[PDB]
Design a protein around this ligand. Structure first.
Ligand SMILES: O=C1CCCc2nc3c(cc21)C(=O)CCC3
Length: 281
């Protein structure tokens, strides 16, 4: 059981030690397409790249590259697309991928500005009457509604294919209260957010994979998926205590490098799963 394993690592403060064994144990696959010189300007950080085998491809013939990985969890029957916060020059690309992958939801776990710097382009409209056009990808994006709460904001967006005149409703879940330094003290508000996305139908196999981003798409995005997947496996299994979070983290890291950036995030992920377990049972 992981609740006993928690106290153990916690009382002995072994979190930096555990996290280093996962660093050591993690997969390394090629990322040749990311390191191509033509794609230098499509990457937010040079040290965070999609693996070739799991990278999402854009259906434009010119350059199919975007910094985005498909995470397939076989046993949980869950998929996620993990991507960097879009750059000013890739907001078109980003909305093309959401179109092409038939995604219902976008989950955002960062503010546009943190620590006085830009962590992300403003890629959605701020006002109903001021829609955005992506000329390069031929998409129009309109704010339909917006429901601001203490910890998170939910927006209803209409994405239209200008080429074909099809329209789709997209939900944007934005967690607005991740602190600039560290992790939340309590996972209550993060668990509330997770369920809010789940109830929306955005995580369901009748839709394309959810799109999940922070700044690099590995730290906070990492915590989102890991909590979702572990909690779902505890429902799916005869013995819920057979679920090892280290095993699941390492299975996710086959798909995208670096998921969970700090020992703090690892601790917080155990805490979210452990608290989340009690809320169900
Ligand atoms: O990382 C960024 C931020 C804004 C968009 C952007 N555009 C370019 C770069 C880098 C970035 C380059 O490295 C070369 C020129 C194009």
């Amino acid at each position: 059981e992981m609740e006993k394993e928690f106290e153990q690592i916690d009382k002995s403060g072994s979190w930096a030690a555990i996290y280093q064994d996962i660093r050591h144990e993690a997969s390394d696959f090629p990322s040749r397409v990311a390191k191509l010189p033509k794609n230098k300007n499509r990457n937010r950080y040079r040290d965070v790249s999609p693996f070739d085998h799991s990278r999402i491809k854009l259906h434009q013939e010119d350059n199919d590259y975007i910094n985005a990985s498909l995470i397939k969890m076989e046993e949980a029957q869950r998929s996620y697309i993990l991507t960097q916060g879009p750059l000013p020059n890739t907001v078109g690309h980003f909305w093309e991928m959401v179109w092409e992958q038939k995604s219902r939801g976008v989950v955002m776990l960062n503010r546009v500005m943190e620590k006085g710097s830009l962590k992300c382009a403003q890629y959605w409209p701020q006002k109903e009457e001021k829609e955005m056009i992506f000329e390069d990808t031929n998409l129009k994006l309109t704010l339909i509604s917006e429901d601001i709460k203490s910890y998170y904001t939910v927006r209803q967006l209409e994405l239209e294919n200008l080429t074909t005149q099809e329209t789709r409703e997209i939900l944007h879940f934005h967690y607005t209260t991740w602190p600039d330094f560290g992790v939340p003290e309590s996972p209550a508000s993060f668990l509330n957010f997770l369920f809010k996305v789940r109830e929306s139908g955005s995580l369901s196999p009748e839709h394309g994979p959810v799109v999940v981003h922070c700044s690099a798409g590995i730290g906070r995005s990492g915590t989102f998926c890991l909590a979702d997947t572990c909690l779902l496996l505890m429902d799916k299994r005869k013995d819920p205590s057979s679920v090892d979070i280290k095993k699941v983290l390492l299975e996710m890291r086959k798909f995208r490098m670096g998921l969970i950036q700090t020992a703090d995030q690892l601790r917080f992920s155990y805490l979210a799963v452990i608290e989340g377990a009690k809320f169900i049972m």
